[PDB]
Design an enzyme around this catalytic site. Structure first.
Site, PDB file in Angstrom:
ATOM      1  N   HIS A   1      -8.729  32.341  53.541  1.00 21.21           N
ATOM      2  CA  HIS A   1      -9.712  32.428  54.659  1.00 21.21           C
ATOM      3  C   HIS A   1     -10.220  31.073  55.115  1.00 21.21           C
ATOM      4  CE1 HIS A   1     -10.843  36.947  54.419  1.00 21.21           C
ATOM      5  NE2 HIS A   1      -9.576  36.751  54.155  1.00 21.21           N
TER       6      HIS A   1
ATOM      7  N   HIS B   1      -0.346  39.122  48.929  1.00 21.20           N
ATOM      8  CA  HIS B   1      -0.552  40.488  48.404  1.00 21.20           C
ATOM      9  C   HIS B   1       0.341  40.808  47.189  1.00 21.20           C
ATOM     10  CE1 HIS B   1      -2.886  41.714  52.351  1.00 21.20           C
ATOM     11  NE2 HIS B   1      -3.475  40.673  51.714  1.00 21.20           N
TER      12      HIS B   1
HETATM   13  C1  HEM Z   1      -2.192  40.530  58.312  1.00 21.85           C
HETATM   14  C2  HEM Z   1      -2.776  39.651  57.495  1.00 21.85           C
HETATM   15  C3  HEM Z   1      -3.698  40.038  56.422  1.00 21.85           C
HETATM   16  C4  HEM Z   1      -4.548  41.084  56.314  1.00 21.85           C
HETATM   17  C5  HEM Z   1      -4.898  42.148  57.369  1.00 21.85           C
HETATM   18  C6  HEM Z   1      -5.182  41.017  55.034  1.00 21.85           C
HETATM   19  C7  HEM Z   1      -6.168  41.960  54.583  1.00 21.85           C
HETATM   20  C8  HEM Z   1      -6.856  41.799  53.319  1.00 21.85           C
HETATM   21  C9  HEM Z   1      -7.914  42.566  52.866  1.00 21.85           C
HETATM   22  C10 HEM Z   1      -8.505  43.697  53.720  1.00 21.85           C
HETATM   23  C11 HEM Z   1      -8.177  42.275  51.609  1.00 21.85           C
HETATM   24  C12 HEM Z   1      -9.310  42.931  50.764  1.00 21.85           C
HETATM   25  C13 HEM Z   1     -10.676  42.188  50.715  1.00 21.85           C
HETATM   26  C14 HEM Z   1     -11.489  42.836  49.606  1.00 21.85           C
HETATM   27  O1  HEM Z   1     -11.826  44.030  49.879  1.00 21.85           O
HETATM   28  O2  HEM Z   1     -11.723  42.243  48.539  1.00 21.85           O
HETATM   29  C15 HEM Z   1      -7.306  41.187  51.299  1.00 21.85           C
HETATM   30  C16 HEM Z   1      -7.154  40.668  50.014  1.00 21.85           C
HETATM   31  C17 HEM Z   1      -6.394  39.581  49.659  1.00 21.85           C
HETATM   32  N1  HEM Z   1      -5.491  38.946  50.494  1.00 21.85           N
HETATM   33 FE1  HEM Z   1      -5.023  39.497  52.357  1.00 21.85          FE
HETATM   34  N2  HEM Z   1      -4.642  40.012  54.339  1.00 21.85           N
HETATM   35  C18 HEM Z   1      -3.837  39.288  55.163  1.00 21.85           C
HETATM   36  C19 HEM Z   1      -3.060  38.175  54.860  1.00 21.85           C
HETATM   37  C20 HEM Z   1      -3.174  37.436  53.659  1.00 21.85           C
HETATM   38  C21 HEM Z   1      -2.624  36.155  53.433  1.00 21.85           C
HETATM   39  C22 HEM Z   1      -1.858  35.291  54.395  1.00 21.85           C
HETATM   40  C23 HEM Z   1      -2.884  35.827  52.124  1.00 21.85           C
HETATM   41  C24 HEM Z   1      -2.588  34.606  51.342  1.00 21.85           C
HETATM   42  C25 HEM Z   1      -1.432  33.944  51.436  1.00 21.85           C
HETATM   43  C26 HEM Z   1      -3.738  36.818  51.586  1.00 21.85           C
HETATM   44  C27 HEM Z   1      -4.128  36.898  50.235  1.00 21.85           C
HETATM   45  C28 HEM Z   1      -4.967  37.918  49.743  1.00 21.85           C
HETATM   46  C29 HEM Z   1      -5.368  38.093  48.339  1.00 21.85           C
HETATM   47  C30 HEM Z   1      -4.959  37.249  47.232  1.00 21.85           C
HETATM   48  C31 HEM Z   1      -6.239  39.102  48.290  1.00 21.85           C
HETATM   49  C32 HEM Z   1      -6.885  39.586  47.056  1.00 21.85           C
HETATM   50  C33 HEM Z   1      -8.365  39.268  46.824  1.00 21.85           C
HETATM   51  C34 HEM Z   1      -8.824  39.614  45.423  1.00 21.85           C
HETATM   52  O3  HEM Z   1      -8.019  39.808  44.432  1.00 21.85           O
HETATM   53  O4  HEM Z   1     -10.092  39.602  45.249  1.00 21.85           O
HETATM   54  N3  HEM Z   1      -3.775  37.878  52.494  1.00 21.85           N
HETATM   55  N4  HEM Z   1      -6.358  41.029  52.306  1.00 21.85           N
END
Ligand code: HEM
Ligand code: HEM
Ligand code: NA
Ligand code: NA
Lengths: 713, 713
Positions: free
Chosen positions: A77, A244
């Protein structure tokens, strides 16, 4: 208390040019972040970060016993606000810690992630900036979980106040499109310069467009928003599937349990927000996005299990415990671990936007390749992660530390090394005289150097005269650059260059990038001479010339000036008034209001206007450097009115006779209207100001010529 | 574009502390206006102003052929915004040329007045500021029309952006009382710090209170608003009758003919406003306030005709041609000249507020005396005009040029001249040792010097440690000053002083004002020693001691700190939150956010709190100069909550055990909550910051001790 903005909400805002004063900065005026960082023990910082990953704090328990997923989200972010349209946003200033980004709904609970890092920040102090630390922590997260990163550069100096950014005109967080302040029009066309679908999101809505859980339609928004952050299809799929692979989402109960965001929270919350009334409010009970998805069987280890799940199951539409749309694997066994209870397992789940990677036909092809060839996936993700986290850092000369990748990447707009002696002061004097003797005019010289240097923007430190990219595609053909005239000037300068370099010994040579700027310098000196003033304009050599093959033409498109008030140019008809665009351009140039005013007044009388327009050329000695713009604009003997043909062009007539004296645009006349700008114009249009005007003009010219000179930093 | 203010409109605004940076200022950082002014040919400027008086411009023709009355109004409006509550407003910064005052309804057509002056401003350039020019022009108007002024001082440096001033909370120009943002409550009680009855007025409504034409009730508003601008009954009657000896009002047709104010006008208006569609829009047809009154038979010559008319006729209520309430002389002949037509004459007329000078019983007596003794009127008006136009300039040491009056006036808070050798560095060392050997504590020494120095405010440059007024009424009895403790410290310091002075040769002596400051310095040095740091605090002698008879006790009441966050003091319960009051105080002290932060943190650990309150005393080593305030405030081991007894007091408890560790106020905890302030706290609470904290604290300490030292300027 009622403010000027309340009374006159559409007046122009100059305070964006006066941020970042030495007043607001707690560090000394002599603090040099790069010097501090170069002595940091980066290896020791990384070891402490590695220990932190598995050292759970009870006020925000670590999922699976490991903070790696949370920190990768935090770093994504931080970088994810970036827009290629203006270069604003990104990770390069650590702005996630200030309003409004610290309180965007998509940044919920990253306040917890940043708080976890304060003990390390405290230990190392000024030697590691928040801005660098955020990124470094995501790299160490990745490494701790078995993923090999492409590298890391330090050098992002901290900032101390919020950046002035247009994030959209909505007055409601997360407003769905089509409202009174819709950021969309036409067939789902997102307004420039925005790069997200809803106010307070990073890119897209994880449920689907405006909440509609269609993966095919979601893919259209993913593609569009990622393109506006400089990422193509391969990079997009690598980043999303890569991210993810780790961690989970948080949606254990209804969102109505979650309280005020940090900027609205009570003082006792001490900088944190989204305090939750649901059960324990944290850990197993956490609510962040409202979704409850865990993507892989090993959330704390790199794997190729994201794609195995995406392709090895069929998916069914379901709801989280907060009521959000999400997907669950049909017929599957409970194979995903629970984050806190070792006796519980869960079925595989996906976001609508995850399923976009399988259901959009172009993504599907790449996802399949990555599924079959996970080594290709790992490599593309590592490269994309580097690009993501460094895209706003500017030229590779700004990159610090022992982990900078050696490979030169085309998106970096690379400048070759200089490997020969530079010209000295005597050489510079000889080349200025040769340029002046060629018959190139002040107007040609000033216009060409302006065009080359004024592509710079401090938002992502792209552009400037280094590289001599003005001679390449696409810059040579931009309308503002006056292609046919530009080509004639560059041909004469190249002949001068070939003759000078052919006469040297010892391998001394001058680049065309340096000679373009030097030639502009000779022009300004000559204009001063035409006015009766002997000045030397400073000049620093050491620019080099980039090739076409080292220049990404599509990436360069965003640097095209479609509005450049300094050349009284507007490419077409915009909604935003031209004076607002002038201020926007001055902010990207790093100019103050006084710098903007001096620079514009001088450029008008030097002949810098596109097409030799007379608008704002308030002088009878064009190509002489005088304060005539200010003296004539301020003359109360002249009355101004909009023309019938065009309400944005004004005629200045003698008040007594009616004789036509001048014409001007809004950009010219704002200096006689705006109460702060007029006060600046008065200083330069006073009878004691000629010396001052010349000095200040030379100083701001040299500033612009050096904006990209991080090799002399 | 939605901004942070839109999202979080009650957040604290730190940008008020970073105004007036060298960024927005076109002059070089070395420019010294005093030096420029001292070379100005003031006699030449006055000749040009005299010529201007009767050089009518067709775009705003001169009434009676003489601009004198318009200029006197212009100068009296420039000075007239002043409030003694905070010292803000007044003529001293030339703020009438910026928003919002350039566009206040009461400043209508003064845009014309300032424009007529531009050619003179242009000719003399930086050597005369706008702010001096507006006042000098009013002086010359008076002299041109036969009135001998008491004198003039230059030295008002121009400013380059709007001042941050609370002018009220109404959202409608000129709103009458009792609305949703009423500045009145109770029995016509005006809210502090306001000094006008309606938003966009200078003092009162010329038709009467809220437009009701009762001269007796209007007098109550006159007295209250003038008192809040530091003027008593005699000065008030002198000013009003004096001003209204000259010129006229303008109300030739309905006000609906007048267009946009300057900040709302179109770009083609080039900084002017109130363009009128009534007849020719100007001159005989002018509309400014909507009233149409001309007071005397010779509007362009000083006379005694104001009071002759006021007393010599009976008055009847009538309407101007715009529909405004005003008064006409019953049965009078047409004796008042017309401003444009020599064949027209008019009956005497008066404003409601003019009639207040006859119908309020206390004014009546003064008015009569002035009527009977016109030389007393002339003298009073001359002195009041000087005070009006200089009340915000500060100590007489700042007054420049050859027309400064020699007479020392009580409202200047005069400081005697020093006529003896000053103490040198060896003397300073001996006096610090004596202070430290007396048994005075760090807390006592720091608190007393803070109390002395921190009455300064940069808004009107009143207050500070020079004068030793802290020993006199009323400062010695202010609750924030801890009267019983103060008296004990002053008794010991006076005995030290008597013994040092009694031992000297030649005339050398030390003032009590210097010794108070010096003793504070020894306190800070001792506290650094208590922390293990070898620190010398700079000290400049030369302060003198003022007498009780040189200290107007009623005028001094406005400097009383009723809120001082630097000593965690609040005298009672206010509507504005205490952290907003802290920022307000830091602005009056001229502090940036980093300065405010470092200062507050140090004061807390030094024992400067009123009554030895533990609130914010986050250290186990009180009276040692350390960064402990920051390190402990930022400790995430402590959780904070408001107490049940008091929502403005907070308890910090160990997160794991619940044990109470500290208490704090809003002022203390803002530094851990506000995202900008917390970023500054992090710097100073880092492991590498102790020596930086000490050195930054000593710098800001010394800054405060020298705020009023215009004798060293
Ligand atoms: C279309 C693009 C994306 C969407 C819509 C998206 C959506 C989200 C959402 C909704 C969460 C959950 C937040 C929460 O409730 O804790 C999240 C978690 C996360 N996203 Fe994404 N994401 C996107 C792209 C990315 C990208 C580019 C990365 C990194 C390279 C990323 C890495 C992560 C990780 C690591 C989590 C886990 C957080 C945790 O373990 O606390 N995401 N994503
Ligand atoms: C109760 C306090 C006062 C009230 C309500 C007030 C009200 C006004 C009004 C409504 C006008 C007419 C503006 C127009 O239509 O052009 C005006 C004019 C003027 N006032 Fe006052 N006044 C006050 C005190 C002052 C004082 C203290 C001075 C100066 C010492 C002053 C000097 C003038 C002059 C010289 C004009 C004439 C302007 C011209 O000839 O263009 N007045 N006053
Ligand atoms: Na950026
Ligand atoms: Na003031």
């Amino acid at each position: 208390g009622t403010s000027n903005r309340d009374w006159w909400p559409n007046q122009l805002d100059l305070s964006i040019l006066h941020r970042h004063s030495s007043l607001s900065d707690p560090m000394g005026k002599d603090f040099n972040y790069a010097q501090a960082f170069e002595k940091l023990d980066l290896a020791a910082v990384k070891r402490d970060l590695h220990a932190l990953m598995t050292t759970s704090q009870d006020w925000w328990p670590a999922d699976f016993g490991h903070y790696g997923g949370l920190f990768i989200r935090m770093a994504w972010h931080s970088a994810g606000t970036y827009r290629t349209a203006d270069g604003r946003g990104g990770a390069g200033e650590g702005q996630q810690r200030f309003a409004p980004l610290n309180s965007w709904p998509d940044n919920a609970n990253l306040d917890k992630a940043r708080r976890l890092l304060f003990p390390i920040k405290q230990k190392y102090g000024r030697a590691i900036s928040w801005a660098d630390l955020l990124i470094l922590t995501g790299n160490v997260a990745l490494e701790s979980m078995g993923f090999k990163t492409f590298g890391f550069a330090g050098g992002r100096a901290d900032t101390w106040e919020p950046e002035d950014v247009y994030w959209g005109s909505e007055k409601i967080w997360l407003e769905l499109s089509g409202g009174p302040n819709s950021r969309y029009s036409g067939d789902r066309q997102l307004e420039n310069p925005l790069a997200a679908v809803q106010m307070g999101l990073i890119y897209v809505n994880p449920e689907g467009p405006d909440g509609n859980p269609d993966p095919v339609a979601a893919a259209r928004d993913i593609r569009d928003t990622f393109a506006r952050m400089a990422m193509n299809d391969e990079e997009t799929v690598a980043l999303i599937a890569g991210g993810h692979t780790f961690g989970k989402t948080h949606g254990a109960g209804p969102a109505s349990n979650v309280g005020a965001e940090p900027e609205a929270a009570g003082i006792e919350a001490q900088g944190l927000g989204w305090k939750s009334a649901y059960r324990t409010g944290k850990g197993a009970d956490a609510i962040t996005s409202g979704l409850e998805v865990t993507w892989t069987t090993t959330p704390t280890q790199w794997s190729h299990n994201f794609f195995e799940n995406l392709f090895g199951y069929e998916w069914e539409l379901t709801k989280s415990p907060a009521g959000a749309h999400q997907w669950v694997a049909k017929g599957a066994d409970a194979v995903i671990p629970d984050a806190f209870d070792p006796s519980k397992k869960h079925r595989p789940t996906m976001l609508t936007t995850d399923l976009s990677l399988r259901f959009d036909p172009a993504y599907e092809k790449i996802s399949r390749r990555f599924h079959e060839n996970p080594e290709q996936f790992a490599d593309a993700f590592a490269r994309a992660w580097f690009k993501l986290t460094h895209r706003d850092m500017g030229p590779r000369a700004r990159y610090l530390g022992p982990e900078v990748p050696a490979e030169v990447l085309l998106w970096q707009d690379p400048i070759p090394a200089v490997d020969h002696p530079l010209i000295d002061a005597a050489d510079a004097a000889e080349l200025k005289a040769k340029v002046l003797a060629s018959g190139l005019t002040v107007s040609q010289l000033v216009s060409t150097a302006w065009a080359a240097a004024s592509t710079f923007r401090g938002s992502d430190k792209r552009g400037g005269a280094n590289g001599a990219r003005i001679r390449l595609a696409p810059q040579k053909d931009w309308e503002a650059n006056q292609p046919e005239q530009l080509a004639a000037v560059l041909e004469t300068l190249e002949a001068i260059r070939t003759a000078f370099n052919g006469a040297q010994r010892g391998g001394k040579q001058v680049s065309l990038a340096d000679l373009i700027v030097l030639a502009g310098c000779a022009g300004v000196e000559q204009a001063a001479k035409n006015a009766g003033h002997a000045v030397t304009v400073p000049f620093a050599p050491g620019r080099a010339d980039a090739s076409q093959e080292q220049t990404d033409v599509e990436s360069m498109a965003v640097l095209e000036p479609v509005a450049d008030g300094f050349r009284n140019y507007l490419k077409g008809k915009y909604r935003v008034p031209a004076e607002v665009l002038l201020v926007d351009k001055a902010q990207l140039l790093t100019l103050s209001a006084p710098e903007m005013t001096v620079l514009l007044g001088g450029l008008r009388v030097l002949g810098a206007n596109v097409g030799q327009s007379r608008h704002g050329v308030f002088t009878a000695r064009e190509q002489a450097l005088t304060n005539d713009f200010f003296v004539n604009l301020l003359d109360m003997g002249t009355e101004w009115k909009p023309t019938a043909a065009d309400a944005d062009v004004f005629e200045g007539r003698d008040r007594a006779t009616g004789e036509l004296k001048w014409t001007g645009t809004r950009v010219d006349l704002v200096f006689g209207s705006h109460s702060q700008l007029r006060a600046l114009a008065e200083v330069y249009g006073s009878a004691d100001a000629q010396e001052k005007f010349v000095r200040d003009f030379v100083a701001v010219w040299n500033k612009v010529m050096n904006l990209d000179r991080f090799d002399l930093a």
